[PDB]
């Protein structure tokens, strides 16, 4: 929705009620996002870096036009700000469509890249751990991919699959359930039938996951953003 920028946090909303975009605003820069006839600009460093996730739709990719600026003043990149939201997690991607001209600053060359620049919700504590997951995996112009990822905590292992993308299909393999510095439940693994991946677990009971995978193809590395729930 547009409300995600221009409405307070009513508790009685769908799922994850807010997320923070400090990870998509450039250092001492701006991020401006707009859609549905509303706009809001997001100054770096501020506390006012929260996006009302509560207003969007659950289990679907929501989309915002965006533009990255810094400091007179120059524009860094533009494209589509993409957010997938579940009840305790959300993944965010930047589909950069134009960038700053490496020669002519104050000029934007056309250039498509895709980078995952967010990961948030209610992480599960690696000590509070108590399932199978199936969800969405998306890269640029590719939002119908699917992810199924199952592990049991007692083995503490890691193995899942990515299919249904229009580009290749990747294997999420042989990964240990570890604990990052924030004491949070966080998987990390390699990936072949081509690079690495990283999951993160969220939710009261670890009901959901959300993270990102990379695939090395020739010289270009395709970032994919994955997320899924249990049932």
């Amino acid at each position, epitope marked *: 929705l*547009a409300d995600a920028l221009t409405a307070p946090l009513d508790h009685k909303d769908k799922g994850l009620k807010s997320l923070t975009l400090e990870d998509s605003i450039p250092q001492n820069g701006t991020l*401006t996002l*707009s*859609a*549905q*006839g*509303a*706009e809001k600009t997001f100054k770096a460093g501020d506390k006012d870096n929260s996006l009302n996730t509560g207003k969007l739709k659950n289990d679907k990719i929501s*989309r*915002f*036009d*965006f*533009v990255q600026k810094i400091e007179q003043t120059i524009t860094l990149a*533009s494209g*589509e700000f993409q957010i997938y939201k579940q009840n305790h997690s959300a993944v965010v991607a930047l589909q950069i*469509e134009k960038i700053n001209n490496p020669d002519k600053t104050d000029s934007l060359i*056309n250039q*498509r890249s895709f980078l995952v620049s967010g990961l948030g919700g209610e992480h599960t504590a690696f000590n509070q751990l108590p399932a199978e997951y199936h969800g969405k995996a998306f890269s640029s*112009d*590719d*939002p*119908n991919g699917r992810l199924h990822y199952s592990i049991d905590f007692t083995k503490k292992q890691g193995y899942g699959r990515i299919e249904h993308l*229009k*580009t290749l299909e990747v294997e999420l393999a042989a990964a240990e359930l570890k604990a990052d510095e924030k004491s949070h439940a966080v998987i990390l693994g390699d990936t072949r039938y081509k690079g690495t991946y990283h999951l993160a677990l969220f939710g009261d009971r670890a009901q959901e996951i959300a993270g990102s995978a990379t695939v090395k193809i020739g010289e270009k590395v395709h970032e994919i953003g994955i997320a899924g729930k249990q049932k």
Partner: antibody
Amino acid sequence: EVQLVQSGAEVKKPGSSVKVSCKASGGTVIDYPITWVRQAPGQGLEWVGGFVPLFRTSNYGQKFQGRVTITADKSTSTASMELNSLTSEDTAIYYCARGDTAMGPFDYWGQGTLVTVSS
Amino acid sequence: SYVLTQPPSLSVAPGKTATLTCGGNNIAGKTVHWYQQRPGQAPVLVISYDSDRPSGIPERFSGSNSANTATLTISRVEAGDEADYYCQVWDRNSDHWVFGGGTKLTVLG
């Protein structure tokens, strides 16, 4: 439940111009990517150009760049397309189409405006 | 891609599946939208982002996109599916919206 509604049929001498206006009923066109698509007799859908609110400007199809202006005026609460130096090849139905994102599919459409250019 | 190739006409028996084609040099790399249009009426978006189905659209309608072909697929065709079907994409390489030529769907029987 939003409904775009358009400026009403037009007749033009060649080399004149036309301004076609679009407004929304259960909503607004303002700060929305408005887009203009035309359809000429016996053909189909063709892009003219469209407003992108973030870059505060409009993009236009290479066929009309130079003789078209796609603008909006928040006082009148209406979007407008203005196509100058008309030819009989400009005879067409003109639809305004709203979408939530500059690359988002047009989910709402006006009812068309028949513009007939002839001498 | 930039050029979208729609056959100008497709014929289908009632209740069978209609398979509408939209061709593109690696159209997989783009996310296409589909509109249906009836005689004397503004277009109505029937599919978006490849294989997304909006509010009022019957589940007989569904879309996919792979290699060099997007496909709008209508199962169990009704007579009121007779319509022109346009496929659209946004071409970043030109900053253009691009519509296919359109396919006139003819329902037999």
